[PDB]
């Protein structure tokens, strides 16, 4: 009726809150692994500093 359908229409927004946690759980980690793979520029800096040391 109306009372049972309004709890399923609130359940559509209940998955809008779980998608709001899904957008902050991966983006905190997919960018942090990009902040840990940035050491390849630092390994390039140690390799470039081994050229001027040579």
């Amino acid at each position: 009726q109306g009372i049972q359908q309004l709890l399923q229409a609130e359940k559509r927004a209940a998955e809008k809150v779980a998608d709001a946690r899904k957008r902050k759980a991966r983006r905190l980690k997919q960018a942090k692994e990009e902040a840990q793979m940035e050491v390849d520029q630092y390994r390039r800096e140690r390799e470039q500093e081994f050229q001027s040391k040579q």
Partner: protein
């Protein structure tokens, strides 16, 4: 007190976006309230008017 008129189907659970209020209307203004229960304020449920117990 409402210790004997309680019913689990008379209120809306998961009250994050809804609320069930026990309203009392007189017998002479029952028809005047039935045409005004949905127009008392904005975002009012216009079909949830259900007389549980009467005096």
């Amino acid at each position: 007190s409402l210790a004997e008129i309680v019913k689990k189907d008379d209120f809306v659970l998961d009250s994050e976006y809804l609320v069930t209020l026990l309203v009392v209307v007189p017998k002479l203004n029952h028809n005047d309230w039935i045409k005004q229960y949905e127009t008392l304020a904005e975002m009012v449920v216009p079909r949830s008017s259900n007389v549980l117990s009467e005096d």
